[PDB]
């Protein structure tokens, strides 16, 4: 009965989170019991940031679905920041596993990131954003 307030998103969803002074950052909605902090305020979600690992209380209106990738992926931040790329890898790796997608490889971080970024930017085909959903 957690996060049952009429707003969007639930435990396990992959999301873009927005905090003041940062780019849209990939996260996963978690339960407050995973944060060891406190119950989220009504209308809010606890998220865990990819690449970074910390927990934040974010309003459900300031979250969007990770599947809306092209609209929130930040090419400039991807170019100037290494942590963003690491976060891209870890978010898309959770995505790739949930969707049943596989990529040919044998490789540095950007080498495996290239086909994952292409997949995500192209719309997560053939599965779609529906294949991102938690189990």
Swiss-Prot record:
Segments forming domain PWWP: 11-69
Cysteine pairs bridged by disulfides in the record: none
Reported tissue expression: Ubiquitous; highly expressed in fetal liver, heart, kidney, placenta, and at lower levels in spleen, colon, brain, liver, small intestine, lung, peripheral blood mononuclear cells, and skeletal muscle. Isoform 1 is expressed in all tissues except brain, skeletal muscle and PBMC, 3 is ubiquitous, 4 is expressed in all tissues except brain, skeletal muscle, lung and prostate and 5 is detectable only in testis and at very low level in brain and prostate.
Superkingdom assignment: Eukaryota
Subcellular location: Nucleus
Post-translational modification: Sumoylated.
Function: Required for genome-wide de novo methylation and is essential for the establishment of DNA methylation patterns during development. DNA methylation is coordinated with methylation of histones. May preferentially methylates nucleosomal DNA within the nucleosome core region. May function as transcriptional co-repressor by associating with CBX4 and independently of DNA methylation. Seems to be involved in gene silencing.
Domain notes: The PWWP domain is essential for targeting to pericentric heterochromatin.
Associated clinical condition: Immunodeficiency-centromeric instability-facial anomalies syndrome 1: A rare disorder characterized by a variable immunodeficiency resulting in recurrent infections, facial anomalies, and branching of chromosomes 1, 9, and 16. Other variable symptoms include growth retardation, failure to thrive, and psychomotor retardation. Laboratory studies show limited hypomethylation of DNA in a small fraction of the genome in some, but not all, patients.
Family as reported in the entry's similarity comment: Belongs to the class I-like SAM-binding methyltransferase superfamily. C5-methyltransferase family.
Record note on quaternary structure: Interacts with BAZ2A/TIP5, SUV39H1 and CBX4. Interacts with UHRF1. Interacts with DNMT1 and DNMT3A, SETDB1, UBL1, UBE2I9 and ZHX1. Interacts with the PRC2/EED-EZH2 complex.
Name by which UniProt lists this protein: DNA (cytosine-5)-methyltransferase 3B
Organism for this UniProt entry: Homo sapiens (Human)
Part of the intact protein present: 215 to 351 of 853
């Amino acid at each position: 009965s957690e996060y049952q307030d009429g707003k969007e998103f639930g435990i396990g969803d992959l999301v873009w989170g927005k905090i003041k002074g940062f780019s849209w950052w990939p996260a996963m909605v978690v339960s407050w019991k995973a944060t060891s902090k406190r119950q989220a305020m009504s209308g809010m979600r606890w998220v865990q940031w990819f690449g970074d690992g910390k927990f934040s209380e974010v309003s459900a209106d300031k979250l969007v679905a990770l599947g809306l990738f092209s609209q929130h992926f930040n090419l400039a931040t991807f170019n100037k920041l290494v942590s963003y790329r690491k976060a891209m890898y870890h978010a898309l790796e959770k995505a790739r596993v949930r969707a049943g997608k596989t990529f040919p490889s044998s490789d540095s971080l950007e080498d495996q990131l290239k086909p994952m970024l292409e997949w995500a930017h192209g719309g997560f085909k053939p599965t779609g954003i529906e294949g991102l959903k938690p189990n």
